[PDB]
Nucleic acid binder design. Structure first.
Lengths: 83, 105, 334, 93, 95, 97, 78, 104, 92
DNA sequence: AAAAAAAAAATTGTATATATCTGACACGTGCCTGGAGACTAGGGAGTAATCCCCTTGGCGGTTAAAACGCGGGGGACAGCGCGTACGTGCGTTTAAGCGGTGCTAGAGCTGTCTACGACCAATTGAGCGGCCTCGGCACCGGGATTCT
DNA sequence: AGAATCCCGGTGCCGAGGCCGCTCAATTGGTCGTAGACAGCTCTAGCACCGCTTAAACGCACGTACGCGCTGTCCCCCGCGTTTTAACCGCCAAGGGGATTACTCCCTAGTCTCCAGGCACGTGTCAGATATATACAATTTTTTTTTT
């Protein structure tokens, strides 16, 4: 099975909830698609770095350690997942 | 006293940090007093963070500290924010803040 | 400043917190159970137990407000004699139907068709044929007041009469009556009767308004007519009212105009309300018994309700073809 | 195999500061990340500046300078003093 | 019915006090699998990595969210518009 | 005659984006560098290379701040800069917590 | 002593940023921000100074300080 | 017969070999790794100098200036991404005028 | 002091024989070459640390080149480096 | 007679007390591996002497740069009217999420054995310091084109 | 018509690329200790499926508060002129501190041996979830009274 039509998997109420955590009172009707695009580009960046870290070790399974190394490579060190 | 940590009156290991220093590819030889300094500064940082974490814990009538509590502790200190305003904490959230212009008049 | 200074004022904040929590703890337990030496901090903080007793007594007062209060029948009948004098002397007068009258007529306190006009509605109608009461504002949405024989112009309902439906299409609007209640067809956020006019041919809109939407038609129920009726009255009366429905809309009372300039207002209710203490004359009793006794001083008999005598059935237009199966509740028969 | 951590030592300092306070596992994870991160940071600038002045040895001085580098004013003033008294206590005996 | 805005602030504080995770695991996992299969076919992922991606994406999006909130309030507005996010991303240093 | 307000502004924009010369006078800069540096310890000596490094680094960082503030201002539906734009820039870039 | 940066210089360096109009409350905040970044960089440089037992700070030390903040500069022995 | 010559490359590799060994990066060094590092070095230098020369010829100049290399490093998106945080000496900025600021 | 001036000059003459260059731009070039040196070697070092290895080879640095550099540039760099190392190993 | 201010009540979240239980934290234990005690050697670092490079300092010219005033015009800002896009609540549909159940690709460790990298003496050339010579480019100026 | 900018020519002037010479560093060569490539065995976690209960997403309609356009105002920088001023250049003196070399002490690395501290594991018990059922200060809105 090949995966398609999944960027729409993040739903409008989810983005509303995220904006409320952001401290926003009003949401425009043209925000969701561009938030989707920003999420898509950042996800592609992080997955590319992580997957490269993955084949570097001659491994066929992605590791959360690879994810951590990538995320601090973009200068986004994350706490509580080891390292 | 046999352990080096007890010799200097520190509560983090000296042998472990010294071994990490030697097996770290930082310098081919290492001095003797460096691990003591490392343990001291580690004492200071860990103690100061855990103190404010416990303060936050007793603020909400809770006897167990959670990374939310540490998030609260780290976001309300001026200098420690400059330390680690760069990092991200798991399930830490954000301190409440509403702009005064957003309030009803 | 210094981190030591940070620690010390944190400590003084801590001692403030501990003293507040321990004064709270000393307050919580009763004085009788505790020892003599204990509670000296509570004793010197007599203001604290003072507002504690204040909280207790204000919750008790609220409970008294909710629970039904009775007055002595003889003082009640004397005050009703004064009420009879007041209702006779006034050339124009307004009476406000209440939720106590709703409970007497089985209408829920604040189906409808099966409900019949109560004896209080009988007495109000009798006052209307005697013309002592010129206008009436009704809390209840039943329309049982119309069944009682009230003139439609004389009675104003803020919720709306369930039997009557008014078309929103026409600018003057078209008024129809149906014996059966329509709440079964109608739902929240939708305002349509679903019954086409015999003449216009457009779907009617029920005069009743649900919760959460605004009625845009003044013909079914006229706000400024009620305000003018209140203004024209020499005195204002209310009976058997929990008042919350009438609390919702102030203009029908015309509470807006100053208390001095307005006609004097009196409220009678078995259950306590703010207008009860606002009223110069207060009477605690069942609304039906009070109205019967008022009729007794007036010397005029209470009417008896009859489906043949109820105006609504004849005022009801014939039902549209196929609408019989639409409504879940059967049509009333006179 | 065996895994190295700082659980016993940080638990000891928890007792030293707060004898009557508990701890959670995610808290242990986040503090372990904190101790690691600060350790490689400080050792990093120490190694850089040791390379910088053409010295092959690492001592208390370069790491004291590193502490005064990454740590703000009052925190650094406290850290240098505590480390000095600690090192003199160690070397005295 | 409450006036418009009280519910807004209610949700604001309700989710500011909350610390949990705000995106359903299955759809976002499907998305990461789809976006990752373009680089090497027949990939295998573990749970720790996907929750790491959860947390990182949530942190970034929240951060850029208050950034755009500041940008919008600077624009004498209470409404947020796409120009706010384009500004925030341009001036943060990406793109 | 009198040029309309803006023509000279565009002219100076064009001339200053076609130039690479240092923009502020050097002696006041050496003065300020000395008079900020002396506070940590006394009796310092400086060389010209460090001073010019500080000069041009500061010039580049500040001009960067200014295109940042310009984007903030044009987004603000304005043609005039105000301090709140600089405050927003310091908010975004995160140097000020 | 901070007044040594003249108003015309600030106007010119705002021009190089592409600004057309300047308010009357800009200069003091520019002075403050330049002061704070200068004090950061000079702290880093002077610490690098006392580390290696010299009484005069060199330019390459400024290069080290600026590269620490991810602000690398070229053309000075970097 | 130098290693740079037997590899066909230009930048030194033995120099790279020593500065890898004294770099405090690993206790041991591989053999072909510096050849790789030199090759990628010649690459990046080749395209940066290519685009710098294009910029210089676009200004009818036979010599290079920090302004030309700044223009080269700013015009292309990939090198901009690589040279993101880097501030260049005597480089300047790309000429840009925003649309609504222009007169109608 | 050591610098890469002559080698860069050879690169110029192999690409642009009829071109003259100043000294400042050469300083920028030297700083640039050193900078990519620390980036590439340092990330190779963390790669060697991560996989619990103690030997530095062509593999970690080639993965690093894939890591820091864009697609067309990355594939060009990896292809040239592989051909160069194969040429180096061909002759002994 | 109308507007403003204070008080009171009703909302509105906001915070809370408590009975049961449950799974996770704390404490006890064996042991085994890293840390500690002792001795040796050797190279790195601390200290003394020199110099000459460089940084600080002063002074006269002049000259572009800075500072101040003033008329004026475009820009900021407040207010008002109006259309609509989004908050909000309810009925309906859907898929996330939990619980087993099973399989297997795949990570991790163990053994070895050979290829590869470190170390050191010889040695030779490519790279670095000095001097040059001369041409590419800056400077002042005249003219060619371009917005206003 | 008009100032500002691009363009072409002439002249001077100091940096850039060559050339000479030498010295440390790259290269040969051999050798010995050692890391990982490879096979194989194993055990565990990710994948796939299924069934079900339910909480969330969606579609819709209604209202209303907000963004936006327009108009008026007033006001505050801009361009230009004129007086003021200190920046910069060039030159000259002097002393400190950076850098280099020589030298002798001593501190880390390394090795061996032995022991005790931490880790994996297991079990008890109690703090917090979880549901249930309630208080409660802030607030805010409406009414009533007072003042002009």
């Amino acid at each position: 099975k090949v995966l398609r039509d999944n960027i729409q998997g993040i739903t409008k109420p989810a983005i509303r909830r995220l904006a409320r955590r952001g401290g926003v009172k009003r949401i425009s009707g043209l925000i969701y698609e561009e938030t989707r695009g920003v999420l898509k580009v950042f996800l592609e960046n992080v997955i590319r770095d992580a997957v490269t870290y993955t084949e570097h070790a001659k491994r066929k399974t992605v590791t959360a350690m690879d994810v951590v190394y990538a995320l601090k490579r973009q200068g986004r060190t994350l706490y509580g997942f080891g390292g | 006293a046999k352990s080096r940590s007890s010799r200097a009156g520190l509560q983090f290991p000296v042998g472990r940090v010294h071994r990490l220093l030697r097996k770290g590819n930082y310098a081919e030889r290492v001095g003797a007093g460096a691990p003591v300094y490392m343990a001291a500064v580690l004492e200071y940082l860990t103690a100061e963070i855990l103190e404010l974490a416990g303060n936050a814990a007793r603020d909400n009538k809770k006897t167990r500290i959670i990374p939310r509590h540490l998030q609260l502790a780290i976001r309300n200190d001026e200098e420690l924010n400059k330390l680690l305003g760069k990092v991200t904490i798991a399930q830490g959230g954000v301190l409440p803040n509403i702009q005064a212009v957003l309030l009803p008049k | 400043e210094r981190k030591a200074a940070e620690r010390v004022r944190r400590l003084r904040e801590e001692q403030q917190r501990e003293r507040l929590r321990q004064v709270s703890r000393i307050l919580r337990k009763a004085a009788a159970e505790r020892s003599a030496e204990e509670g000296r901090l509570l004793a010197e903080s007599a203001d604290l137990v003072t507002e504690l007793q204040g909280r207790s007594r204000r919750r008790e007062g609220l409970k008294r407000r909710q629970e039904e209060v009775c007055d002595d029948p003889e003082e009640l009948r004397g005050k009703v004699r004064e009420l009879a004098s007041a209702v006779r002397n006034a050339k124009y007068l307004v009476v406000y139907t209440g939720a106590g009258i709703s409970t007497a007529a089985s209408i829920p306190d604040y189906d409808l068709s099966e409900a019949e006009p109560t004896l209080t509605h009988m007495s109000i109608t009798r006052l209307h044929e005697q013309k002592l009461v010129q206008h009436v504002v009704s809390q209840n949405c039943d329309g049982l007041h119309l069944r009682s024989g009230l003139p439609r112009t004389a009675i104003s309902e803020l919720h709306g009469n369930m039997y009557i439906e008014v078309c929103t299409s026409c600018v003057p609007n078209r008024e129809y009556v149906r014996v059966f209640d329509v709440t079964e067809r109608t739902a929240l956020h939708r305002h349509q009767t679903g019954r086409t006019c015999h003449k216009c041919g457009t779907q009617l809109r029920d005069t009743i308004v649900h919760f959460g939407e605004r009625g845009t038609l003044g013909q079914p129920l006229n706000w400024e007519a009620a305000t003018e009726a209140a203004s024209r009255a020499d005195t204002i009366l209310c009976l058997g009212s929990s008042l919350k429905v009438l609390k919702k809309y102030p203009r029908l009372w015309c509470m807006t105009k100053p208390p001095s300039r307005r006609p004097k207002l009196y409220i009678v209710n078995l259950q306590w309300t703010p207008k009860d203490d606002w009223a110069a004359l207060k009477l605690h009793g069942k609304c039906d018994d009070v109205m019967r006794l008022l009729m007794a001083e007036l010397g005029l008999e209470i009417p008896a309700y009859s489906r043949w005598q109820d105006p609504i059935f004849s005022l009801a237009t014939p039902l549209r073809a196929g609408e019989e199966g639409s409504h879940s509740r059967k049509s009333l028969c006179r | 195999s065996r895994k190295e951590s700082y659980s016993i030592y940080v638990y000891k300092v928890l007792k030293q500061v707060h004898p009557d306070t508990g701890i959670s596992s995610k808290a242990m994870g986040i503090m372990n990340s904190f101790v690691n991160d600060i350790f490689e940071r400080i050792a990093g600038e120490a190694s850089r500046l040791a390379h910088y002045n053409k010295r092959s040895t690492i001592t208390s001085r370069e790491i004291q300078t590193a502490v005064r580098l990454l740590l703000p004013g009052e925190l650094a003033k406290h850290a240098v003093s505590e480390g000095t008294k600690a090192v003199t206590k160690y070397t005295s005996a | 019915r409450y006036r418009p805005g009280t519910v807004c602030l209610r949700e604001i504080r309700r989710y500011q006090k909350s610390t949990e995770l705000l995106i359903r695991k299955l759809p976002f996992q499907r998305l990461v699998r789809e976006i990752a299969q373009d680089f090497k076919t027949d990939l295998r992922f573990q749970s720790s990595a996907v929750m790491a991606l959860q947390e990182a994406s949530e942190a970034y999006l929240v951060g850029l969210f208050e950034d755009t909130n500041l940008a919008a309030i600077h624009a004498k507005r209470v409404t947020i518009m796409p120009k706010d996010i384009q500004l925030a991303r341009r001036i943060r240093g990406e793109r």
